[PDB]
Amino acid sequence: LWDNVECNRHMLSRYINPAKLTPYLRQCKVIDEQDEDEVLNANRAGRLLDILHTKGQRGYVVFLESLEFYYPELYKLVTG
Amino acid sequence: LWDNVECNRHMLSRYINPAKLTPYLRQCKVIDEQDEDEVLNANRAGRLLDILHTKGQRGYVVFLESLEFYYPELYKLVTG
């Protein structure tokens, strides 16, 4: 069920601003400060998803919560 | 319907040499040499796909052929 986000790899990267998300992910200890700069200052969105696919269910749950909040319409697009 | 390619996007990237596909692709007349060395003279293959997206359905069709040809196992997963 990570294959939700993965189908939508293309368009998300196209619409989402990663910078808005990563804070809440930093907070929820899904990612650390190294991954936030690594995303932000290593298109950079694809990087974020890349690293999130490494994080299992805990990752997905949180990302989706952030995706819902800042990107509600896109999120519907992803979720069924 | 880019979906078969674009759901397997993460795993297609990790297992393709764009160098094997480009000359085929150019010659098919779907991409041009600017495209070829834009991609090549560089998920350095994410770009290849992204570019093909830009061509729509002919892009899709012809990308699928090159898998039928050069990564026949990848072709398999992609077509089911």
Side-chain angles (χ1 to χ4, degrees), chain B:
Chain B
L1 238 50
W2 261 98
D3 280 346
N4 297 208
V5 186
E6 276 290 1
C7 291
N8 296 96
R9 171 174 272 263
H10 184 112
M11 79 80 70
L12 279 166
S13 342
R14 175 47 175 91
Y15 305 121
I16 272 181
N17 184 20
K20 312 240 169 293
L21 294 193
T22 16
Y24 173 72
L25 274 173
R26 290 191 45 175
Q27 189 228 175
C28 265
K29 292 278 153 213
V30 296
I31 74 145
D32 61 44
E33 77 152 43
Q34 178 168 233
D35 313 325
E36 182 178 77
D37 73 79
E38 189 224 298
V39 179
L40 252 33
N41 296 316
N43 203 108
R44 307 109 303 101
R47 185 68 48 250
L48 176 54
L49 298 159
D50 300 324
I51 254 154
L52 299 155
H53 225 267
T54 270
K55 306 251 109 70
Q57 184 199 220
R58 204 87 65 159
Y60 180 60
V61 158
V62 184
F63 175 65
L64 252 45
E65 275 159 41
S66 44
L67 301 157
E68 187 161 26
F69 281 136
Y70 291 92
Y71 303 92
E73 253 70 80
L74 285 190
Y75 176 56
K76 245 74 143 241
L77 207 202
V78 158
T79 47

Side-chain angles (χ1 to χ4, degrees), chain A residues 1-41:
Chain A
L1 205 74
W2 202 288
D3 288 287
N4 267 286
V5 191
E6 206 55 32
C7 291
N8 293 65
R9 193 121 187 145
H10 197 70
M11 71 78 31
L12 288 175
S13 313
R14 196 144 78 176
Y15 294 79
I16 130 229
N17 172 6
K20 303 215 196 278
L21 310 149
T22 50
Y24 178 60
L25 319 186
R26 243 255 66 170
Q27 191 144 235
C28 306
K29 294 269 124 189
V30 192
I31 62 160
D32 54 296
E33 46 217 324
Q34 164 136 333
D35 312 359
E36 170 138 48
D37 58 62
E38 219 276 308
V39 162
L40 260 303
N41 317 291

